[PDB]
Amino acid sequence: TATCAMYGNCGKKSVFGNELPCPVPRSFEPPVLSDETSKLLVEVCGEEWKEVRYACCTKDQVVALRDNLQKAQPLISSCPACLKNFNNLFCHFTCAADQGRFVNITKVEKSKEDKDIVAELDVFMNSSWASEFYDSCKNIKFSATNGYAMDLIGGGAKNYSQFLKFLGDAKPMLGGSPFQINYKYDLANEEKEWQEFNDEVYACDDAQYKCACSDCQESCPH
Ligand SMILES: *[C@@H]1O[C@H](CO)[C@@H](O[C@@H]2O[C@H](CO)[C@@H](O[C@@H]3O[C@H](CO[C@H]4O[C@H](CO[C@H]5O[C@H](CO)[C@@H](O)[C@H](O)[C@@H]5O)[C@@H](O)[C@H](O[C@H]5O[C@H](CO)[C@@H](O)[C@H](O)[C@@H]5O)[C@@H]4O)[C@@H](O)[C@H](O[C@H]4O[C@H](CO)[C@@H](O)[C@H](O)[C@@H]4O[C@H]4O[C@H](CO)[C@@H](O)[C@H](O)[C@@H]4O[C@H]4O[C@H](CO)[C@@H](O)[C@H](O)[C@@H]4O)[C@@H]3O)[C@H](O)[C@H]2NC(C)=O)[C@H](O)[C@H]1NC(C)=O
Ligand SMILES: *[C@@H]1O[C@H](CO)[C@@H](O[C@@H]2O[C@H](CO)[C@@H](O[C@@H]3O[C@H](CO[C@H]4O[C@H](CO[C@H]5O[C@H](CO)[C@@H](O)[C@H](O)[C@@H]5O)[C@@H](O)[C@H](O[C@H]5O[C@H](CO)[C@@H](O)[C@H](O)[C@@H]5O[C@H]5O[C@H](CO)[C@@H](O)[C@H](O)[C@@H]5O)[C@@H]4O)[C@@H](O)[C@H](O)[C@@H]3O)[C@H](O)[C@H]2NC(C)=O)[C@H](O)[C@H]1NC(C)=O
Ligand SMILES: *[C@@H]1O[C@H](CO)[C@@H](O[C@@H]2O[C@H](CO)[C@@H](O[C@@H]3O[C@H](CO[C@H]4O[C@H](CO)[C@@H](O)[C@H](O)[C@@H]4O)[C@@H](O)[C@H](O)[C@@H]3O)[C@H](O)[C@H]2NC(C)=O)[C@H](O)[C@H]1NC(C)=O
Ligand SMILES: CC(C)CCC[C@@H](C)[C@H]1CC[C@H]2[C@@H]3CC=C4C[C@@H](O)CC[C@]4(C)[C@H]3CC[C@]12C
Ligand SMILES: [Zn+2]
Ligand SMILES: [Zn+2]
Ligand SMILES: [Zn+2]
Ligand SMILES: [Zn+2]
């Protein structure tokens, strides 16, 4: 059914860190989602996951995904198109049934439980999707303190590659990624066993997820 790059967690790498995911082979098929995990996955990732029965994530992985998304949510919550694109990226990265085809584990280490945990991985990204994703978040204004939201979730990223690099770089102490995540844009077309991440993307002037003119340039009148 589903092909995963990782499933579950195999312990922590430090006494104060958090547990890290277990690399699984390509022939591994995850079990059916529990009722508890399925209901929680819908609350965190939206109604798109109601009919999903096989996912590449456990309940603990969804809870870790929820805790980290809720820390960055208030920074981009004013722009629904960015929030929708933002959550959609990390939800497929964690739970999509085709995770094993766009996530390539490249480096592992041993945990305190003496098991292999992810240390560094590659995510094959579709340039057009990452470009439109950055275009929907680059102009969000943090209210009151008159700043840019991209200065926090992106560290002041000037293009989409610097945006995903800020999101993927290992920042465990700063509430970021517990391990190194590299976004690759040069996946060869000859590689048929791999594929690039590509989903529906929403611009900040989209009708269903329109953002204010203060946060979206294309939503402003002329
Ligand atoms: C979004 O915006 C960002 C920001 O602008 C863009 O990111 C930049 O993208 C460009 C273009 O892709 C990259 O340029 C290449 O740089 C490498 C070396 O990178 C070093 O220098 C960068 C400059 O540093 C400045 O800032 C840093 C802080 O970042 C600061 O510390 C420093 O003081 C300075 O002020 C560094 O940023 C870079 O950091 C590394 O680590 C980063 C963190 O992980 C990483 O993100 C970076 O990507 C980088 O890896 C690093 O210190 C150059 O080698 C390369 O030039 C080669 O390629 C071109 C094109 O073919 C060619 O013209 C050159 O000749 C050169 O090719 C020679 O060198 C190759 C490497 O040795 C070798 O393989 C070749 O064979 C060739 O060697 C032959 O010729 C030479 C003579 O040229 C000869 O001596 C040899 O013997 C041999 O015969 C590029 O210039 C930037 O690195 C990158 N920066 C960052 C921060 O990402 C991004 O592209 C934008 N994206 C979009 C979608 O728009
Ligand atoms: C998804 O992620 C995967 C990683 O999890 C990616 O897999 C990696 O893919 C790359 C290419 O895309 C592979 O690189 C090739 O590796 C070949 C094997 O290298 C071995 O032999 C080299 C030459 O030796 C020849 O002769 C001897 C004796 O007859 C034979 O036994 C050999 O088979 C070969 O015919 C040798 O140079 C190499 O040693 C190190 O140096 C190379 C080049 O710099 C590096 O590839 C690497 O650093 C090698 O280190 C390896 O061994 C050391 C200890 O020796 C360990 O750290 C570790 O085990 C490391 O693997 C090595 O002995 C080579 O012939 C080719 O020229 C390419 O270099 C990677 O091997 C492969 N990693 C794997 C399978 O684990 C995958 O690409 C990625 N997918 C996508 C789509 O991105
Ligand atoms: C990265 O993301 C890109 C953006 O989503 C992907 O680009 C898409 O790629 C698909 C497949 O190649 C394209 O769909 C094709 O469109 C052409 C266009 O033909 C037009 O004219 C014919 C003739 O009448 C008509 O029948 C078509 O409907 C079109 O009107 C078609 O010929 C194909 O049959 C097919 O429908 C998308 O158009 C394209 N979207 C873009 C560029 O925005 C890209 O594939 C992704 N790459 C990777 C590696 O994942
Ligand atoms: C720099 C700060 C703002 C980070 C912004 C992006 C946040 C929301 C992203 C970046 C990398 C992401 C993590 C990458 C990998 C995993 C492992 C998985 O098993 C559970 C989700 C979890 C733990 C993700 C949670 C969300 C996360 C932390
Ligand atoms: Zn149905
Ligand atoms: Zn989706
Ligand atoms: Zn591409
Ligand atoms: Zn690296």
Residue numbers in the entry: 20 to 241
From the paper:
To study the substrate scope of NCR1, the NTD (residues 1–249 of NCR1) was purified and crystallized with either ergosterol or cholesterol: ergosterol-bound structure at 2.4 Å (Rfree 26%) and cholesterol-bound structure at 2.6 Å (Rfree 26%). Besides the sterol, the two structures show minimal differences between them (root mean square deviation of C-alpha atoms, RMSDCα, of 0.39 Å). Ergosterol and cholesterol are highly similar in their chemical structure, but the quality of the electron density maps allows for clear discernment between the two in the NTD binding pocket. Cholesterol lacks this double bond in the iso-octyl chain, making it more flexible, and this is observed as density that is discontinuous with the ring system. The hydroxyl group of cholesterol is closer to Q80, 2.8 Å away. The substrate binding pockets of the two structures are virtually identical, with both substrates positioned parallel to helix 2. Structurally, however, the substrate binding pocket of the NTD from yeast is less occluded, with 10.2 Å between K90 and I172, compared with 8.1 Å between the equivalent residues in the NTD of hNPC1. Even though the binding pocket of the NTD is less occluded, cholesterol seems to bind 1.0 Å deeper compared with the NTD from hNPC1. The clear density of an ion in a well-defined cation coordination site on the “back” of the NTD was identified. Because ZnSO4 was used in the crystallization solution, a zinc ion was modeled.
